[PDB]
Design an enzyme around this catalytic site. Structure first.
Site, PDB file in Angstrom:
ATOM      1  N   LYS A 250      56.806  13.824  69.086  1.00  0.00           N
ATOM      2  CA  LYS A 250      55.771  13.098  69.805  1.00  0.00           C
ATOM      3  C   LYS A 250      54.938  14.048  70.659  1.00  0.00           C
ATOM      4  O   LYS A 250      55.425  15.072  71.144  1.00  0.00           O
ATOM      5  CB  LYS A 250      56.395  12.008  70.673  1.00  0.00           C
ATOM      6  CG  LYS A 250      56.702  10.735  69.897  1.00  0.00           C
ATOM      7  CD  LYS A 250      57.343   9.681  70.770  1.00  0.00           C
ATOM      8  CE  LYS A 250      57.239   8.311  70.128  1.00  0.00           C
ATOM      9  NZ  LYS A 250      58.116   7.311  70.797  1.00  0.00           N
ATOM     10  N   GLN A 310      72.086   9.804  69.018  1.00  0.00           N
ATOM     11  CA  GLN A 310      70.930   9.629  68.143  1.00  0.00           C
ATOM     12  C   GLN A 310      70.531  11.023  67.664  1.00  0.00           C
ATOM     13  O   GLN A 310      71.103  12.027  68.099  1.00  0.00           O
ATOM     14  CB  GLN A 310      69.781   8.926  68.867  1.00  0.00           C
ATOM     15  CG  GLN A 310      69.190   9.763  69.998  1.00  0.00           C
ATOM     16  CD  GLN A 310      68.320   8.960  70.945  1.00  0.00           C
ATOM     17  OE1 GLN A 310      68.518   7.759  71.125  1.00  0.00           O
ATOM     18  NE2 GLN A 310      67.347   9.622  71.557  1.00  0.00           N
ATOM     19  N   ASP A 345      60.277   9.464  66.557  1.00  0.00           N
ATOM     20  CA  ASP A 345      60.781  10.826  66.500  1.00  0.00           C
ATOM     21  C   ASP A 345      62.298  10.911  66.397  1.00  0.00           C
ATOM     22  O   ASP A 345      62.834  12.024  66.359  1.00  0.00           O
ATOM     23  CB  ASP A 345      60.302  11.618  67.728  1.00  0.00           C
ATOM     24  CG  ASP A 345      60.580  10.900  69.050  1.00  0.00           C
ATOM     25  OD1 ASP A 345      60.744   9.662  69.059  1.00  0.00           O
ATOM     26  OD2 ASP A 345      60.624  11.584  70.092  1.00  0.00           O
ATOM     27  N   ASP A 380      72.967   7.439  77.276  1.00  0.00           N
ATOM     28  CA  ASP A 380      71.673   6.903  76.889  1.00  0.00           C
ATOM     29  C   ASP A 380      71.845   5.629  76.069  1.00  0.00           C
ATOM     30  O   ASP A 380      72.522   5.637  75.037  1.00  0.00           O
ATOM     31  CB  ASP A 380      70.927   7.971  76.092  1.00  0.00           C
ATOM     32  CG  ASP A 380      69.499   7.608  75.824  1.00  0.00           C
ATOM     33  OD1 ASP A 380      69.228   6.995  74.773  1.00  0.00           O
ATOM     34  OD2 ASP A 380      68.645   7.955  76.658  1.00  0.00           O
ATOM     35  N   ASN A 381      71.248   4.534  76.542  1.00  0.00           N
ATOM     36  CA  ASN A 381      71.124   3.291  75.787  1.00  0.00           C
ATOM     37  C   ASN A 381      72.421   2.798  75.137  1.00  0.00           C
ATOM     38  O   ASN A 381      72.439   2.495  73.939  1.00  0.00           O
ATOM     39  CB  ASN A 381      70.048   3.454  74.723  1.00  0.00           C
ATOM     40  CG  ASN A 381      68.695   2.998  75.189  1.00  0.00           C
ATOM     41  OD1 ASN A 381      68.554   2.427  76.268  1.00  0.00           O
ATOM     42  ND2 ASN A 381      67.682   3.230  74.362  1.00  0.00           N
ATOM     43  N   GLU A 409      73.283   3.413  80.836  1.00  0.00           N
ATOM     44  CA  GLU A 409      71.847   3.143  80.953  1.00  0.00           C
ATOM     45  C   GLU A 409      71.481   1.911  80.123  1.00  0.00           C
ATOM     46  O   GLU A 409      70.746   1.968  79.138  1.00  0.00           O
ATOM     47  CB  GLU A 409      71.042   4.365  80.532  1.00  0.00           C
ATOM     48  CG  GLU A 409      69.551   4.263  80.816  1.00  0.00           C
ATOM     49  CD  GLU A 409      68.721   4.227  79.550  1.00  0.00           C
ATOM     50  OE1 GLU A 409      69.116   4.878  78.559  1.00  0.00           O
ATOM     51  OE2 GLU A 409      67.676   3.546  79.540  1.00  0.00           O
ATOM     52  N   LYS A 520      58.138  13.427  80.063  1.00  0.00           N
ATOM     53  CA  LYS A 520      58.921  13.328  78.840  1.00  0.00           C
ATOM     54  C   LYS A 520      58.273  14.067  77.674  1.00  0.00           C
ATOM     55  O   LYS A 520      58.972  14.431  76.723  1.00  0.00           O
ATOM     56  CB  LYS A 520      59.131  11.854  78.475  1.00  0.00           C
ATOM     57  CG  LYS A 520      60.088  11.115  79.401  1.00  0.00           C
ATOM     58  CD  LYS A 520      60.217   9.647  79.035  1.00  0.00           C
ATOM     59  CE  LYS A 520      58.865   8.954  78.987  1.00  0.00           C
ATOM     60  NZ  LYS A 520      58.983   7.488  78.737  1.00  0.00           N
ATOM     61  N   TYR A 521      56.960  14.308  77.728  1.00  0.00           N
ATOM     62  CA  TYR A 521      56.246  14.916  76.613  1.00  0.00           C
ATOM     63  C   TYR A 521      55.464  16.169  76.997  1.00  0.00           C
ATOM     64  O   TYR A 521      54.715  16.691  76.165  1.00  0.00           O
ATOM     65  CB  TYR A 521      55.303  13.890  75.974  1.00  0.00           C
ATOM     66  CG  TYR A 521      55.887  12.496  75.908  1.00  0.00           C
ATOM     67  CD1 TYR A 521      56.965  12.213  75.081  1.00  0.00           C
ATOM     68  CD2 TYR A 521      55.365  11.465  76.678  1.00  0.00           C
ATOM     69  CE1 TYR A 521      57.505  10.942  75.017  1.00  0.00           C
ATOM     70  CE2 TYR A 521      55.900  10.188  76.622  1.00  0.00           C
ATOM     71  CZ  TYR A 521      56.971   9.934  75.789  1.00  0.00           C
ATOM     72  OH  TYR A 521      57.511   8.672  75.728  1.00  0.00           O
TER      73      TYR A 521
END
Ligand SMILES: O=P(O)(O)CCN1[C@H](CO)[C@@H](O)[C@H](O[C@H]2O[C@H](CO)[C@@H](O)[C@H](O)[C@H]2O)[C@H]1CO
Ligand SMILES: O=P(O)(O)CCN1[C@H](CO)[C@@H](O)[C@H](O[C@H]2O[C@H](CO)[C@@H](O)[C@H](O)[C@H]2O)[C@H]1CO
Lengths: 649, 649
Positions: A250, A310, A345, A380-381, A409, A520-521
Site C-alpha cells: 500500500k 497474517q 496487501d 493483532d485482531n 486488539e 502506517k504508510y
C-alpha cells in the site's frame, strides 16, 4: 448425596463460565468474594472465606458480613499474593453464640428463665473453649463459664461476664461454628502486577531516522527511549518489526499502489528476506534488537511486540505452507478484510486444514522473541482467528512462561470481547475512545469495574494509529488534555500512540477516524526538540499523570471506583480508593467552554461523615483546597482540564 | 482439551445452580432454550436445540434465531413430552450457504469475479446435496449446481437459479452445517400436568358435621365434595387428619387453655391414640378415609394431605425418640415459635442427632398415605426444617413415585423460597396475598413468569386459614371477586380456603391477618344450602372462572404473560397466549369506586398489527366487543369486577 449442605452456601462469586475458567487477579490486588448464605429457623449464621495458595496453604481468617439487610448475600475482601493458580471456598456455619447473646440480652433484664438461660450460655462457651488453641485464650473463656454458673451473684452480673471485650476478642478470632458447611473450590489465576497496572507508549522505530538515512534503525530509534521513560511509561509497544512485502504494497494515505520509496505497512509481514522470526533489514539485525531491548530495560521499559497472524503475498509461508491459506478455485488467495476496511496487501490465515502446524509454528515464533526478552505481545485482531486457537496458544506459552502477557486488539461485539479475556487474554482493548459523554463514561466504567473485572483487564489507549476520534479532532489540545486525565485515572493501564503529545488531530477526511498522512504508510519525522522548547507538547501533563499514578495506589487498581453527582452534564466526578489512599477527580468534558458546577460528593462512600470537611491537594497544580459534601468548581479549557486531588491526612 | 469449541456455544439457559439441579417443565409445556453463539470473522452461523427424552431419542429439528441484533444471543422454543428426566444441548455451526448468498447478491450485479463466485457456489451446493436424505431433494440441488456452471447463460440468471424458493425449502429443512460444535448436556425434569396446572380447595372435614354429631367424619365430609367439584376444582387439601394432642391444646380464638369440648388445632399432631400414620378417632377409620378418597376420585378430585413435621407433647415420638427434639438443661422441650407467633401446643423437631431415623420415618409415613391414594402433599413450613432434609426426602419419594407432588408452604425470604423449589419442591406458595396494587402485581408476576419459572411453579392461594389480608377485610364481596379473578387468570394453579366464597372477612382485630373465631381451633359449620339459596356466595363466579380456565389453554401455563398499559392506577390489563388461544383480562382493583379507562394494547405482542380491530368476548357475561389499539373500559364494583375475554375468529 445432596447438592445442598447442612448450612446452605450457594452461588459463590466471582465465577467465570460456571467454574470452568479461572477468575483473575494480580499480586496485591483486592476483590470481594461473595455467596448466598442462610439457614433454617431464625438463629444466626456466619461465614468466612478460605483462600488457598498454589501449594494449598490457606490464608488468614477472613469473616464475611451480610452485604445488605434481608438479602442473605454475604461477602468479604481477599488479597491475592504470589503468582500462580489459587483456589477459594466459602464456609458457612451456625452462629450459636450470637443467637444466645441476642436472646439473653432480652430474657435476663426481664427476669425470664434466667437460671436456665445463663447455664445454656455456660455450655456454649465451654464448647467454645474446646476449639480454642491458645491457653491464655482458653482460660478467658472458662472464666466467663464459671462466672455464668455463679448462682451467688446477680443474673445481670453473671451475664455481663460473658459479654466483655476480652471475650469478644477470643470469639472474634475462634468463634464457635456449628454445622460448618463448605462450597466447592473455585479457581483463581493470580498474575504479575504489569498485567493489571502499567502505562503504555507506541511508536514506529522507522520514523526516528537521520537526514542521511531517513529510515530509522533500532540503534537510532533507541534515542527516543529516554524521553519515553522520562514521561513515566513502563511499556513500549512496537508495530511489527519484520520484513514488509512488495506485492500489493500500500502507498501513502492508504493508496493501493506503492510508488518508488514508499515503505508499506508493517503489518503486511513477510518477504524473501524473512518472516515473523526475522528483522526488517532497514531496522538492523537481531543483534541490534538485543541492544534496543537492553537499553529499554535499563530505563525501566518493557517491550511489547505486535503479533499479527497474517501474511503479505511474499511471505515464505505462502509457498512452504500453502494449506495455511484458503484458495479459490483458480488458486488465488483473497486478501484479508474487516469490513468496511480492506487489506489488499495481506492474506488471512486458514486454520482448519492444519491446525496443529499453525499452533506449533505460532508458539515457536513467540518463544523466539521471548528468548530475546519480549514478555508482552499485542495480539493483532484476535477475533478474526478461531477463539480456541488463542486458548490453546496462550495455555501453551503460559504453561512454561506464566509471566508472558497477551493483549487483545478486539474492537468487536461484546460477547467475543468477553470470551477472549475469559480464555486467557491478560489484557483487552476497550470501547474507551468511543465513550466521551458523562453518561457513556459512567455507564462503561461501571461495567468494566463491576463483574467484568473478574476476567478482563482494560488497556485505555486514548488514541491508536487507526483511531483519531472526532472528539480530539474538534477539541484540539484541551480535548487531548481531558482524554489523558480520564484514561490515566479511570484505568490502571493506559496508553498513547506517539504524536498524541503534540495533539496531532488532522483526520484523513471529515467523518474518518484515520490520521491524514498516516504513519502506517510513511515515515513521520517529528521535531520533538522544538515542541518541548516551544511548549507545544502535553508531555509535561503526561509526565505528571504517570507520577501521580506511581504515587497513589488507588490509581493502580480497577475495581474500587465510584461516581459522584454534579449539577452540570459536562462535568464528571469520581473517586477511587486503595487502603488509606483516596484520589478524587473532577473533569470538564467540554473542550471549548469554561464550566462551573457544584460537586455533591457521596461522603460515606469516601469513609467520611456528611458534615465533615477534608483537605485535598490538586496534584496537577499543588493548590490546596478544603472540600465537603458540596463543592464549587470552575474549569477553563486550556488552563485546566481537571482537578486530580488526593485526600490529605 | 480446550474449553471452547470450534464454533463457540456458551451460557446455555435455562440453568439451575450451574447444572447441579434440573430445570423444570410439565408435559405439554413450552419454554425457550437459549445460548450465546458466534464465530470468528464475519461469516454467518446457525444454531439448533437437541432435546433428548429419557431413552435418549432426540426431538425434531429445532433451529434457533438471534433474539436481538448484535447480541449473539440465540433461542428456540421447545415442548416437553412424557414425564421423566430429559436433557438438552445447543449445536452451533458455520452456515456457509447464507454466507455465500449474501456475498454473491452483491458481487454478481457488480461484475466482480462472477465466474469465480458462481463456481464457488456450485461446489458449496454440491456439498449440500450429498447430505440430504431424499432423492427429490438431491435432484433439486444438483439442478441448481448445473445452472450455476452454465457459462452460456448470463451471470444473474446463473445465480438466480440458486435462490429460488424450492432451493430455499430444501436447505431450510436440511441445511449445510460446517464445524458442528455442541454444548455439554443440561438436565430437564418433566412432571405431570397437575404440578403446574390445577385449582385447589382447602377445607376442614370436622366442620362438615351433623346436628346430632357436630364433629364431622370422613363419611359426612364426603358429602361436601360434590359442591367442590361443581365449583370446578381439581385438588382438595386437608389440614392434618391425625389425632390431636391435649397438653397445652389451644382454645377458641387461639387462647392458651382449651376447655371441655374444644377440638384444638389439627397441626398439634399426636396422642396416645397414634401419630402421623393414624386417623383422628372422631374422623373415623382408615376404611372411612378410603371411602372418602374413592368419592373424591369419582368427582375428579385428588387428595392433598398436610404434612407437618412437628409433634404435640402427647405424641409417641416424645418418649420413643427423645433425640428428635432439642431439650433444655432441665430436660424440657421449648415450644415452636415463628415470631412473634407462638405455638405453645407443639414441639419442633431436632434433626442433627438422628437424621437417618427421621428420614426413614418420614418416607415411611408418606408411602403409607401414598398407598391410600394420596399423591399430593402440602408440606407445613418447610423452611424451619433443614433444606437438605427436604432434598433427601423428596428424592427418595420421587425416586419410586415421580408422580408425587410436593407443595412448599414457605412464606419467608426470597433465597430460601427459591432454594426449596430448586432442591425438589414441585409447587410453592408465594407472596400473592401481599401483592394488591397494579405495581405490586405487575412487578411480582413479571418475576414469577420470568426466570424463576425454570424451577418454581406458583400456587396462588387467595386466602389461607392464616391469611385474611386487609384488602378483603376492607373491600367486602367486590374485593373477593377481584382477587379470585386475579388468582385464577394470573397463575395456572390457584386455590381458596373454605369461607372465601361466603366473603368471610372479620379479622381477629384491626391490623391482624387472622380470622375471628378461626376454624383452626373450633368447629365452623356453614349453611351451604342457605348460602346458595340467598345468593350470598360467589361460588358461581368461582365456577365460571374455573370453567374459563378449562376451556382456554392459555390460562393453563405460566411463562407467557404480558401487561398492557392503562390510564388509571386502579385498572390493570394483561394477556396470556398458548397456540391459537389468546386471553385478555382487564381488572378493576378498586372494590369501592367505579373506574373508567382506556386499555392501550401492545398489538404486536398479540400477533396483530397496530391498525386492526379484532373480536373479543367477555367470558363472565357473554357480551362481545371489537377491540384494537385503544379501548375504553368501564368497570363497576359488584356488577363487573373485570373483563375476562377470549379472542374470537
Ligand atoms: O484497522 P483495524 O480495524 O485496527 C485492524 C487491526 N490491524 C491493525 C490494528 O492496529 C492495523 O495496524 C492493521 O491495518 C493496517 O495494516 C494493514 C496491513 O498492511 C493495512 O492494509 C491497513 O490499511 C492498515 O490500517 C490491521 C490488520 O493488521
Ligand atoms: O401461623 P403461621 O405463621 O402461618 C405457621 C403455619 N403453620 C400452618 C399454616 O397453614 C398453621 O395451620 C399452623 O399454625 C396453627 O397451628 C398451630 C399448632 O401448633 C397453632 O398453635 C397456631 O395457633 C395455628 O395458627 C402453623 C404451624 O403448623
Amino acid at each position: 448425596p445432596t447438592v445442598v449442605g447442612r448450612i446452605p452456601v450457594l452461588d459463590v462469586r466471582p465465577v467465570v463460565q460456571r467454574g470452568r475458567r479461572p477468575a483473575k487477579a494480580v499480586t496485591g490486588e483486592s476483590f470481594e468474594v461473595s455467596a448466598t448464605v442462610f439457614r433454617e429457623g431464625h438463629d444466626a449464621v456466619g461465614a468466612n472465606v478460605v483462600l488457598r495458595d498454589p501449594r494449598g496453604r490457606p490464608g488468614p481468617w477472613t469473616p464475611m458480613r451480610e452485604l445488605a439487610p434481608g438479602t442473605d448475600r454475604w461477602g468479604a475482601t481477599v488479597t491475592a499474593g504470589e503468582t500462580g493458580t489459587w483456589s477459594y471456598t466459602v464456609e458457612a456455619w451456625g452462629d450459636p453464640v450470637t443467637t444466645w447473646r441476642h436472646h439473653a440480652r432480652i430474657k435476663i433484664p426481664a427476669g425470664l428463665d434466667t437460671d436456665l438461660v445463663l447455664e445454656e450460655g455456660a455450655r456454649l462457651y465451654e464448647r467454645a473453649a474446646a476449639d480454642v488453641p491458645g491457653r491464655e485464650d482458653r482460660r478467658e473463656l472458662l472464666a466467663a463459664v464459671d462466672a455464668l454458673r455463679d448462682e451467688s451473684r446477680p443474673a445481670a452480673s453473671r451475664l455481663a461476664a460473658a459479654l466483655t471485650p476480652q471475650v469478644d476478642a477470643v470469639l472474634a478470632r475462634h468463634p464457635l461454628r456449628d454445622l460448618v458447611t463448605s462450597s466447592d473450590p473455585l479457581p483463581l489465576l493470580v498474575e504479575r502486577e504489569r498485567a493489571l497496572y502499567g502505562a503504555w507508549y507506541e511508536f514506529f522505530p522507522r520514523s526516528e531516522g537521520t537526514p542521511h538515512t531517513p529510515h530509522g534503525t533500532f540503534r537510532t530509534a533507541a534515542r527516543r527511549l529516554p524521553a519515553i521513560a522520562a514521561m513515566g511509561f513502563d511499556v513500549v509497544y512496537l508495530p511489527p518489526i519484520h520484513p514488509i512485502g512488495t506485492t500489493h504494497r500500500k502507498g501513502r494515505n492508504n493508496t493501493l499502489s506503492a510508488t518508488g520509496d514508499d515503505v508499506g505497512s508493517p503489518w503486511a509481514i513477510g518477504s524473501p528476506e524473512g518472516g515473523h522470526d526475522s528483522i526488517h533489514p532497514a531496522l538492523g539485525t537481531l543483534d541490534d534488537f538485543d541492544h534496543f531491548v537492553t537499553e529499554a530495560g535499563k530505563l525501566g521499559l518493557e517491550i511489547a511486540l505486535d503479533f499479527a497472524l497474517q501474511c503479505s503475498p511474499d511471505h515464505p509461508w505462502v509457498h512452504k505452507h500453502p494449506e495455511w491459506f484458503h484458495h479459490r478455485p483458480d488458486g488465488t488467495i483473497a486478501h484479508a478484510e474487516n469490513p468496511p476496511k480492506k487489506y489488499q496487501d495481506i492474506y488471512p490465515i486458514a486454520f482448519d486444514a492444519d491446525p496443529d502446524g499453525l499452533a506449533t509454528e505460532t508458539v515457536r515464533i513467540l518463544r523466539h522473541w521471548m528468548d530475546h526478552g519480549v514478555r508482552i505481545f499485542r495480539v493483532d485482531n484476535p477475533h478474526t482467528k478461531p477463539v480456541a486457537f488463542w486458548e490453546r496458544v496462550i495455555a501453551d506459552i503460559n504453561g512454561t512462561d506464566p509471566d508472558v502477557i497477551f493483549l487483545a486488539e478486539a474492537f468487536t461485539r461484546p460477547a467475543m470481547m468477553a470470551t477472549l479475556a475469559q480464555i486467557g487474554f491478560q489484557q483487552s482493548y476497550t470501547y474507551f475512545t468511543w465513550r466521551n459523554t458523562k453518561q457513556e463514561l459512567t455507564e462503561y466504567l461501571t461495567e468494566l469495574s463491576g463483574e467484568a473485572a473478574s476476567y478482563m483487564r482494560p488497556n485505555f489507549f486514548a488514541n491508536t494509529p487507526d483511531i483519531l476520534h472526532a472528539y480530539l479532532q474538534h477539541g484540539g489540545r484541551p480535548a487531548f488534555e481531558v482524554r489523558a486525565v480520564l484514561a490515566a485515572t479511570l484505568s490502571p493501564t493506559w496508553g498513547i500512540y506517539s504524536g498524541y503529545e503534540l495533539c496531532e488531530n488532522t483526520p484523513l477526511r471529515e467523518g474518518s477516524e484515520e490520521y491524514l498522512d498516516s504513519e502506517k504508510y510513511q515515515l513521520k519525522p517529528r521535531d520533538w526538540t522544538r515542541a518541548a522548547r516551544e511548549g507545544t507538547t502535553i508531555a509535561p501533563l503526561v509526565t505528571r499523570l504517570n507520577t501521580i499514578r506511581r504515587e497513589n495506589p488507588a490509581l493502580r487498581q480497577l475495581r474500587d471506583l465510584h461516581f459522584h453527582p454534579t449539577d452540570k452534564e459536562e462535568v464528571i466526578a469520581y473517586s477511587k480508593r486503595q487502603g488509606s489512599n483516596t484520589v478524587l477527580v473532577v473533569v470538564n468534558l467540554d473542550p471549548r467552554h469554561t464550566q462551573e458546577a457544584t460537586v455533591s460528593l457521596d461522603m460515606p462512600q469516601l469513609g467520611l461523615d456528611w458534615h465533615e470537611s477534608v483537605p485535598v491537594r490538586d496534584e496537577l497544580t499543588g493548590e490546596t483546597y478544603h472540600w465537603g459534601r458540596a463543592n464549587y468548581v470552575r474549569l477553563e479549557p486550556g488552563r485546566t482540564p481537571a482537578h486530580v486531588c488526593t485526600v490529605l491526612r
